[PDB]
Amino acid sequence: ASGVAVSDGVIKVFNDMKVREVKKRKKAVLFCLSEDKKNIILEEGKEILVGDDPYATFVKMLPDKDCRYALYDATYETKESKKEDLVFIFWAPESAPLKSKMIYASSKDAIKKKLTGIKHELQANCYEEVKDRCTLAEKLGGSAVISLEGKPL
Amino acid sequence: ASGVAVSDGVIKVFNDMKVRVKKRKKAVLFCLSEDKKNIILEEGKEILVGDDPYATFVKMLPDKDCRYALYDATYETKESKKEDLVFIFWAPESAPLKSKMIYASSKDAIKKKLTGIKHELQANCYEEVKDRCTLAEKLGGSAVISLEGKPL
Amino acid sequence: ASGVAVSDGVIKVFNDMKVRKSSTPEEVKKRKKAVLFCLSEDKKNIILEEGKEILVGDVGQTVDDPYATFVKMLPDKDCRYALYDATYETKESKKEDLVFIFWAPESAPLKSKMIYASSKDAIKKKLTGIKHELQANCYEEVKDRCTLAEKLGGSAVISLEGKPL
Amino acid sequence: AALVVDNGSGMCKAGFAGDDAPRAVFPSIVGRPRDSYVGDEAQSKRGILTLKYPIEHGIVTNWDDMEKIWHHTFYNELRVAPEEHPVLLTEAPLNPKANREKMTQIMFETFNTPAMYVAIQAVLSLYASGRTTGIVMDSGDGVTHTVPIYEGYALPHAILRLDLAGRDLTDYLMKILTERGYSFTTTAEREIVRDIKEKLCYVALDFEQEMATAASSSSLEKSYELPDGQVITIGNERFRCPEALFQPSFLGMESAGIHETTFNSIMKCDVDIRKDLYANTVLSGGTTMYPGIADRMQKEITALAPSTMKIKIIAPPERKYSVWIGGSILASLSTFQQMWISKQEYDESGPSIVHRKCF
Amino acid sequence: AALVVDNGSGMCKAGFAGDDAPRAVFPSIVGRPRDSYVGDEAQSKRGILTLKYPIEHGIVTNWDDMEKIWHHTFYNELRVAPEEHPVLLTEAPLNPKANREKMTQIMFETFNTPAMYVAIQAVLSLYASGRTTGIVMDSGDGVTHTVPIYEGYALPHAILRLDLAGRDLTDYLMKILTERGYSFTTTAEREIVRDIKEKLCYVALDFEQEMATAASSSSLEKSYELPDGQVITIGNERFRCPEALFQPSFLGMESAGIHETTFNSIMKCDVDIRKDLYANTVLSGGTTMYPGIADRMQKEITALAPSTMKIKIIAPPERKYSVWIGGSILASLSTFQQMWISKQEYDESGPSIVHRKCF
Amino acid sequence: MPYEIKKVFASLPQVERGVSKIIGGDPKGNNFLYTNGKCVILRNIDNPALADIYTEHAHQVVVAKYAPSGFYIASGDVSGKLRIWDTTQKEHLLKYEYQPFAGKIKDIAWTEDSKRIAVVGEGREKFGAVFLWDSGSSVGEITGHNKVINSVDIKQSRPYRLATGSDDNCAAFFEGPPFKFKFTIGDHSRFVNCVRFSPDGNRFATASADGQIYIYDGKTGEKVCALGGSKAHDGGIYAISWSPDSTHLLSASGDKTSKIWDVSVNSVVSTFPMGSTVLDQQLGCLWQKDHLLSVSLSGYINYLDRNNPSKPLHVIKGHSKSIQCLTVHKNGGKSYIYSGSHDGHINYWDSETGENDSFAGKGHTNQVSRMTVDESGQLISCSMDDTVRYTSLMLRDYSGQGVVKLDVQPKCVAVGPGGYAVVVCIGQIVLLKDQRKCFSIDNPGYEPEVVAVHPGGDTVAIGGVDGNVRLYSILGTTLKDEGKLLEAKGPVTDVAYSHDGAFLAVCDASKVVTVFSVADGYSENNVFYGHHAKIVCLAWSPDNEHFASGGMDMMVYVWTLSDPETRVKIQDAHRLHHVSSLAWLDEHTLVTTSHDASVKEWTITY
Numbered sequence A: 001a002s003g004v005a006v007s008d009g010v011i012k013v014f015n016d017m018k019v020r021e022v023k024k025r026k027k028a029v030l031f032c033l034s035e036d037k038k039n040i041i042l043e044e045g046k047e048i049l050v051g052d053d054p055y056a057t058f059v060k061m062l063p064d065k066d067c068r069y070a071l072y073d074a075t076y077e078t079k080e081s082k083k084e085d086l087v088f089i090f091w092a093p094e095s096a097p098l099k100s101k102m103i104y105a106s107s108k109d110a111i112k113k114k115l116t117g118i119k120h121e122l123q124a125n126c127y128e129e130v131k132d133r134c135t136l137a138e139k140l141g142g143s144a145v146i147s148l149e150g151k152p153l
Numbered sequence B: 001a002s003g004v005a006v007s008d009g010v011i012k013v014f015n016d017m018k019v020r021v022k023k024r025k026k027a028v029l030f031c032l033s034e035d036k037k038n039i040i041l042e043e044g045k046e047i048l049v050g051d052d053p054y055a056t057f058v059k060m061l062p063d064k065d066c067r068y069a070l071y072d073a074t075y076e077t078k079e080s081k082k083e084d085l086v087f088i089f090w091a092p093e094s095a096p097l098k099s100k101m102i103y104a105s106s107k108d109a110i111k112k113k114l115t116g117i118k119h120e121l122q123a124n125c126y127e128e129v130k131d132r133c134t135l136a137e138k139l140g141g142s143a144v145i146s147l148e149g150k151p152l
Numbered sequence C: 001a002s003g004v005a006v007s008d009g010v011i012k013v014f015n016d017m018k019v020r021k022s023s024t025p026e027e028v029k030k031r032k033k034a035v036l037f038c039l040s041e042d043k044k045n046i047i048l049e050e051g052k053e054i055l056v057g058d059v060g061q062t063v064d065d066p067y068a069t070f071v072k073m074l075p076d077k078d079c080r081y082a083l084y085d086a087t088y089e090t091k092e093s094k095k096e097d098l099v100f101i102f103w104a105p106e107s108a109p110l111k112s113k114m115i116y117a118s119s120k121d122a123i124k125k126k127l128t129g130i131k132h133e134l135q136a137n138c139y140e141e142v143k144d145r146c147t148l149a150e151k152l153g154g155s156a157v158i159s160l161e162g163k164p165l
Numbered sequence D, E: 001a002a003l004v005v006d007n008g009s010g011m012c013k014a015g016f017a018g019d020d021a022p023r024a025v026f027p028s029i030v031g032r033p034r035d036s037y038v039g040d041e042a043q044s045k046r047g048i049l050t051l052k053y054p055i056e057h058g059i060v061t062n063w064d065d066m067e068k069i070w071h072h073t074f075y076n077e078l079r080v081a082p083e084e085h086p087v088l089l090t091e092a093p094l095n096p097k098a099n100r101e102k103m104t105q106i107m108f109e110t111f112n113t114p115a116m117y118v119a120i121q122a123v124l125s126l127y128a129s130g131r132t133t134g135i136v137m138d139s140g141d142g143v144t145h146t147v148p149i150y151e152g153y154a155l156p157h158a159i160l161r162l163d164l165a166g167r168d169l170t171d172y173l174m175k176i177l178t179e180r181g182y183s184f185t186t187t188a189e190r191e192i193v194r195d196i197k198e199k200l201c202y203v204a205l206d207f208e209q210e211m212a213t214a215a216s217s218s219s220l221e222k223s224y225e226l227p228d229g230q231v232i233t234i235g236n237e238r239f240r241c242p243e244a245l246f247q248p249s250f251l252g253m254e255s256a257g258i259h260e261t262t263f264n265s266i267m268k269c270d271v272d273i274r275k276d277l278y279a280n281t282v283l284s285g286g287t288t289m290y291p292g293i294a295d296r297m298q299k300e301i302t303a304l305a306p307s308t309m310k311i312k313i314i315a316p317p318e319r320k321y322s323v324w325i326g327g328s329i330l331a332s333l334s335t336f337q338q339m340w341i342s343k344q345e346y347d348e349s350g351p352s353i354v355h356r357k358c359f
Numbered sequence F: 001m002p003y004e005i006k007k008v009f010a011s012l013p014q015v016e017r018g019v020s021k022i023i024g025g026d027p028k029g030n031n032f033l034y035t036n037g038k039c040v041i042l043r044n045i046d047n048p049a050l051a052d053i054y055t056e057h058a059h060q061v062v063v064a065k066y067a068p069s070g071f072y073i074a075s076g077d078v079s080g081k082l083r084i085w086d087t088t089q090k091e092h093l094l095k096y097e098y099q100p101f102a103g104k105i106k107d108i109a110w111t112e113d114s115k116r117i118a119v120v121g122e123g124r125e126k127f128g129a130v131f132l133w134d135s136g137s138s139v140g141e142i143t144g145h146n147k148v149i150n151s152v153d154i155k156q157s158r159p160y161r162l163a164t165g166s167d168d169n170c171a172a173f174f175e176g177p178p179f180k181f182k183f184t185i186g187d188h189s190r191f192v193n194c195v196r197f198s199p200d201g202n203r204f205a206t207a208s209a210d211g212q213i214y215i216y217d218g219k220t221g222e223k224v225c226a227l228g229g230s231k232a233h234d235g236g237i238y239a240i241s242w243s244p245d246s247t248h249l250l251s252a253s254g255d256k257t258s259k260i261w262d263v264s265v266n267s268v269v270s271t272f273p274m275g276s277t278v279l280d281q282q283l284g285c286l287w288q289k290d291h292l293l294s295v296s297l298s299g300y301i302n303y304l305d306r307n308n309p310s311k312p313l314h315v316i317k318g319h320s321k322s323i324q325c326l327t328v329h330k331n332g333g334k335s336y337i338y339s340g341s342h343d344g345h346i347n348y349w350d351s352e353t354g355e356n357d358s359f360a361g362k363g364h365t366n367q368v369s370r371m372t373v374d375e376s377g378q379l380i381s382c383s384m385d386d387t388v389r390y391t392s393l394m395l396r397d398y399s400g401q402g403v404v405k406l407d408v409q410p411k412c413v414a415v416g417p418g419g420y421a422v423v424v425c426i427g428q429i430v431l432l433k434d435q436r437k438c439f440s441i442d443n444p445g446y447e448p449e450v451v452a453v454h455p456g457g458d459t460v461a462i463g464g465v466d467g468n469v470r471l472y473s474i475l476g477t478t479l480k481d482e483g484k485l486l487e488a489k490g491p492v493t494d495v496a497y498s499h500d501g502a503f504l505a506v507c508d509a510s511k512v513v514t515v516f517s518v519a520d521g522y523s524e525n526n527v528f529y530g531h532h533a534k535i536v537c538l539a540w541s542p543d544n545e546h547f548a549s550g551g552m553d554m555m556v557y558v559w560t561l562s563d564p565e566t567r568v569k570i571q572d573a574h575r576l577h578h579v580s581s582l583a584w585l586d587e588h589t590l591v592t593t594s595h596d597a598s599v600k601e602w603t604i605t606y
Ligand SMILES: Nc1ncnc2c1ncn2[C@@H]1O[C@H](COP(=O)(O)OP(=O)(O)O)[C@@H](O)[C@H]1O
Pocket: D007, D008, D009, D010, D011, D012, D139, D140, D141, D142, D143, D166, D167, D194, D197, D198, D199, D285, D286, D287, D288, D289, D290, D320
C-alpha cells in the first residue's frame, strides 16, 4: 500500500456510472495520480460520453508510457441475455517508468476497494492486451459471451 | 445382508401378537441360534400380559450381547388410548464386535418378514432404552402424555 | 555382476514357498519354512542345499523355535543364500512375510564372499515379490532374534514366530 | 476361506475373512520411472520413479494402475491365488455405476475369482457398530465422507465429500515442522512425518485455550527419534496439525470443517430422520483416531445443532479398520455363502449382475 | 531517511529509501570458531570457523544470529544508528505469524527504531512489474518460491517452496569443475566459483542439442582468470550448472524443476484465474538472472500447459533486486509516512500491531 | 419446578490488546451488554451481580446492540452471521438471522424507527451493509472505505445520517434512507476506532488511534472543533460515549486514563487515572444515566467516580477466560465460591450478595486444574505451572504463602485431615504433608487421572484410564496400595467421596456413575444411567443422600442415592458449553461453572 488517498469525485463518478441523462452518462473514464502523487484524481479531458467503436477510442486514449486506471461500461450480448457491467481497467504499460508502475500497482486496491460492487477487472500490461477484444469478452462471461460492443466476436 | 433367515417360531409369535389374556405375551426377546443361522426365541425372556412391565423388560436385556425384541407398548394420548407394536434392536457397545455385525446386518431381513410394524427403537446403550421420552415420541409425536400407565 | 544363473529348482521352490495354494492338511506340513541356497561345485548355478531346509510340519512338533534352528543350519565358514518365512505380529496386524537372508561371515574365504555378493543381485531380481532382506556378516548379526524384528517392521513388531520379543 | 480387500485412497487393507485384523496394509500407489513398482516398493525407491494414486478420492481414476495393485495384493501381500478364494470388495460412497461394472469385470476375467461381492464402506462401518440407521463420518487418507444411512440404505442426495483428510494433515505437519528448522521434503521423509502425526498429534477441545496453556506447559514438548538416530522435538504442532480438520483455513482452504460437513449432510435429510442421525454419528477411518477428536466433534456439532437435540458422537476403539473388520465378519458367515456373485451367474448376466446382487 | 532491508536466505540487501540500488549486499552468515564474525568477515577469515545461516530457507530459525546480522547491517554496512531512521523489512511468503511479531519486537526493543514496517517479498516484486495479479517465481540463494497472487492477495494454499536455488548451483559447479581438473574446495575458492557462475553460466534452450554442440566444437568454451592470475577454461559446465534448476536429478533431488513447480502451483488455483496466472509469470531473484532462462521457462511451461492457453514469462531487467527496489520506492513516498508503525503505537498494542497496520 | 436458576455471575468482557471493545446500552437504561466468546452478557448496570447470558452463536460474538424500541438485540460474530432475537422473554427466541457478508462483523447500528440495521466490518467483497430488519433487502450502499470498518452510527433524529470509521484513517458520511455516500472525512491520521452520534443528533464525534477526537455537525458533517486542542489523549482512544443530555463526552484511551469532555466549550471536566500497567489500558466505555463505565485490558469493568477520579466506585472483577475449577467454602457466617480459570486467575464470589474480588499479590501463571479447601481454612490449588499453592482464605493474599513445586505437571489434588495432600501428576502420585513432598509413587503401573481422599484421611481412591479405581492408605509418610481394584465401565474421569465418607461415587467416559458403599467392603451400591456423553464432573450434596454429575452432553443430572430411577435433568445449564465443575452451597443450592467463564446457582427441589 502506497498510502495515497482516492479522491471523493471518483466514488461519485462510479456511483453515477454503476446505476442507470443518457447523453451525459459516461461510457469510459480515466484516473491518475495528482501532480503531488497523493490523490487518485479524475483526468479532466479523458472520458467518453454515452451519447457520443467506443472501445477503440478508449484504448487510444491510454498513454503509451504511463500507468492509468479506467472504468469501462462495457456492453455485451450473451446467448441467454444481453447485459452491461462495469469493468475496472488497470493500464500499466511495460514502457512506463519503474516508479510509475510500482505506485500505481501498490495503490490499485485503494481505489478498487473503494468502488464496491465492481465485478470485472482487466489487467492490461501492454497494448496487445488491451486492444485484444477477445480477452475482455472472456473476463466478462468467458465462453458465454458471443458478441461484444454490439459486434460479433 | 448376512443372509440369516428368521425361524417360523418368531413369525408365528409376531402374528399372534400383531392381530388382537394371561396366555398372551407383552414382551419377547429374539436371539441368535447357536449355529448363527436362524433367529430363535429365547427360553426365559418373555413377559406375560397376565403377569412395571417396561422396567423388568430392560432387566432381561443382556449387558454384553445383542438381542431383538418385540414390545406391545401401550401409550395413552389425550384423544384416545392406542397400543401398538414396537421393534427394539438391543445392541450394547459392550457386546462383542462379531455379534454386533451379525445382528445389525441381519435386521432388514427380519423386519421385512415382520410385516405391519411401524415403530422401531434402536437402543445401543442402557440410557437409550431405560428412558421413556424417546420411546414415547416414536409412538406419537408431541401427543403422548403417559406411557405404560406411569405418567411421563 | 558375476553372471551366475539361478537354477530352475530354486525358482520352483521359491514359487511354491511364496504363494500358498489350497491343499490337504498333510500337504500343508510339506511346505518349506526356511530353505538354504548355495553355489554349484562348478560355481555356475545357485543350486538348492539338499538337507538344509525346515518344513512347516516340523515347527511346533520337533522344531520349537524355527528361527533358532534355522541359524544353526548356516555354516560359520561359508556364505549362503537363505529364504526364511517369518510369521511375526505388529500392534495392528498379524503378518507372514518372506525374508531373503544373505549369510556371508567374515571367516569365509574371499573367493566365496566375492562371488556370493556379486551374484546376489541376479538371484534377488529373479525372486520377485520379496520385500525384506537381512544382510548378515557375522553370527552376532543373525543369531539375535531381535535383528529380524527391526528388519521386518522395526519397533512396531511385538511378536515373532508366535512368541513375544 | 474368503479374501477381504478394502481399497482406500491412500492405503489398501487386505486379509482373510474371519481374521481380527487385515494381514496386509500397504500404500495404494503405483510408481513408474522418472519399470513399475507397486506398494511399499515404490516408497523404497523414491526419486527414481514417479508416484501416482489410482484411487485418490475413493473413486478409481486409473483402472490400468489399480489392476497392478490388485495383483500385488493377491500374490505379493496375501500370497494366495485369487482364483481359489472368493473376494469381498469395498466401494467408496457415491461410486459411479460404471465403476461397479468395471470392478466386477476385472475380478472375474483378469483374476478368475470363483465368487465375488461388493459392499459399501460406510454401511460396513455402521453395521460393525451395531447400527442400521445413522451417519458415518469416514475420514481417511485422501477423502472425508459423511454418509447418512437410513435402515441400511445410504442416502445419495445427502452424501457430502470433503477433500480434507489425513493426506493434507501430513503435508500441514510437514510445512509447520520446517518452522522449527527441520527439513522434511523427500518422499521417504514424508512417511516419517506421518509416523509423528500418528503418534504425537491430538485434537484440543478448545484451540485458543490450548494455545494459551501450552505456552508454559512442561508436558507439551515431546521428542521423536528419526530412523537414522536423530531426535526431533515437537511442541504446539501436536494439536495444531489436526486442528486443520475443524479449521481448514489453516491449509488455505475455503471449505467447511468436518463438523460442519457432518452437520450439512444431516440438514440435507428429512426432518423425520434428523433426530436419529444426530444421535448416531459414527466416526470411522484412520484420521478419526486422534485422541480427543470425539469430544471436540461433540462440542462443535452441538453448536450447529438445534437447541433441543441429543448429539451422540460414536468413536469405537476399532474404528480405524471398521470397514475391513465388518467385511471380514460378514464374509466369514456361513449364511453369507449364498450372497456371493458366482462365476456362472456372471456369464449369464454380465457385469450388470453387481447392480442386483450386491445392490 | 528510511532504511530498506531485504533479509534474503543467503544475501542481505540493505540501503536507503529513494536510492536505485541497495548500498550494502553482504552474505547472511554468522561464523563462529571451529568469537563471532558476521557477513563478509566470516568469508574472509579462512576455513578456521563454522558458518551458519540464521535464515537458510527464507524463515528465521535462529533469532540470536539474526540480531547479529541486523546489528552488522545498521552499524558496519549502512553506518547509521537504527534509533534515528525508520526501517522497512521484507518477509518471505508463508512466514509464520509468530516470526512476524518477533521481528517487530526486535526492531522496537533491541534497536529502538522510531518506525517500522513489514512487506511481503513476493508482492513487492509483482508490484514493481506494474502488476497486481500474477505468479512470482522468486529464486534466490537458499530457496525458490512460486507465489500465485490474485488481486494483491497471495494464495497460501498454492504457494510452493523449493529448496533448490543459487547455493545448490554454486556447489554443483564446484563438483563438476573438478572433472576438468580444477580443485575448488576451500571457502575462498567457493567465492571464485560463484563469480564464474555469475559471469559465464547460461541456460540452454535445448540441453541435449547444446551438449552435442559443446562436444563437437569449442565455440562455447570460455576463459576465466583466477585472482592469482591463472586462467582456467570452462566448456559445457556453463549450461550444465543452471540446468539443475530444470532437472533437479543432477543434484540427486526428488523435487520437480522450477518450470514444473510453477506449473504445479498454477494448477493448484481456481480455473477462472489460471489463465491470468499463465500470462503473468514474473521472474525475480538472483538465480533468475541467467541469460536464456525466460526463453527456457517459456518453452517448458508451454509443454505442460494446455495448447489453447497463452504463456508469458516476465523477466524485467531489474528483477535481481526487485524486492528491494519496490520497498525503496514505497518507503520513499510522501504518502507512506502515515503507513509506518510508530514506537508509540508499538507500546500500546504490542507486537500484534503488525497484523493490523501491515498485512 | 425441579430446578430454577437463582443467580448468574456473568463473565467479564473478552478484551484484546489494541482492539476496541464495544459496550451497548439499552434505551430503557436498565442493562448494559457486552460479549465474551459465543455468549452475549446482559448485565444490570445498577446491580452488576444480576445478569443474563445469551449463548446461541456458533462463533465468537463481536458486538451486540439493543434496538431503539428495546424489544430486540442484534448480535454478530466473526463469521458474519447476524441474529436478531427477542429480549422481552427469557427464552430469547430468534426473530431473524442474516449473513450480510462473509467476514468479521465489527459494529451494528439501528435506525430510530428500528426497522433498518447497518452492519459493518470486513467482508470478502464489501465492508458494510444496511438492510431492512425483517427482509434483509438492501436500503443503501456503504462505499468509500478500502479497509475494515471499525465503527458505525446512525443519526436518531430527522434527517437520518450514517457515519462509519475504518482503518484507512478516514470517516465516511452517508445520507438517507436510502443511504448514499456524501463525502469522506480525512482529518484523522490513524485508525478511526469509534464514531458516535450525540443522542439528540446535533453532533457526532470520531475517535482514532492518533489521540484526537473531532466534533462534526450531525446534519452537514462540517468540523466544529477538536477536543483538547492539540490532542485529546496521550494515546489511541478506543471508545467514546456521549452523555444522555448530549453535552458531555466520555472517552477511553490506551494511555491508561479516561476523561470527561465538555464538548460545547472544548474543555476536559474530569480525568480518571486508571493505572500504570499494560492491563490498565481502557478499551471500552459507556455513559448510561449517572453510571460511567470503563473496561480495562484485564477485562475489569470500572464504575468511574466523578467526585474521586483516582478511585472508582466499583471494579467489577471475574473471569474473562474459561473456568476450570470451582470450590465453595463457608468462612464466618458467609459462604464464598472460589473459581479458577485457565489463565491462573482465582476469583472468589459472595454466594448471596454476589460481590466478587481476587486474591491480592501474584499467584498462579497457568491453568488452575483443581482447587480444594482443607480443615485449616487454606485453599490448595494445583496448576499447570507445576506448582501446588496453599493460600490462606482469611488473608486473601498470595504473597507470603506456601508454594510447592512439582517436577511433573499435576492433574488433580485432594486433601484430608491431618495436613495430608495427594497430588496426581502425569504418571506419578505425590503425597504432600505440611506443604512438603514426603512420598512418591512414580511408575505406579497405570495412568492416574483423579484422586479422592476419604473424609477420615486414611483411604485414597485414585482412578485410571484403565477404568479401575485403586485404593491406597495414608500410613505415616507413605501410601500403601491396599490391593483393591474397584471396577468402572470406562476410563475414570472423576471420583468423589461422600461428605460422611460412607459412599464413593465414580464416573467414567462410558456415561455411567457407579456408587460404592464404603461401609460394606467397598462393594457396588448402585449404577446410574442417563448421560449420553462423557461425564466430566461430580459433586456430593451436603445431605449425603443426593449427588450431581455434569457431562459433555451439556446436561446436569442430580441423582437420588436411594432411587436411581429418579433424577433432575438440568438441560443446558450453560448453553453450548459443558459444565467443567460444580459444587453445592447447601442441600438445595447447586453451583455450576463452565468454559463460558460464568458461575450459576440453581435451586434444586426434590
Ligand atoms: N493412529 C492414527 N492417528 C492419527 N491419524 C492416523 C492414524 N492412523 C492413520 N492415521 C491416518 O489415517 C490415513 C489412512 O487411514 P485410512 O482409513 O486407511 O484412509 P484410506 O482408506 O482412505 O486410505 C493416513 O493418512 C494416516 O496417516
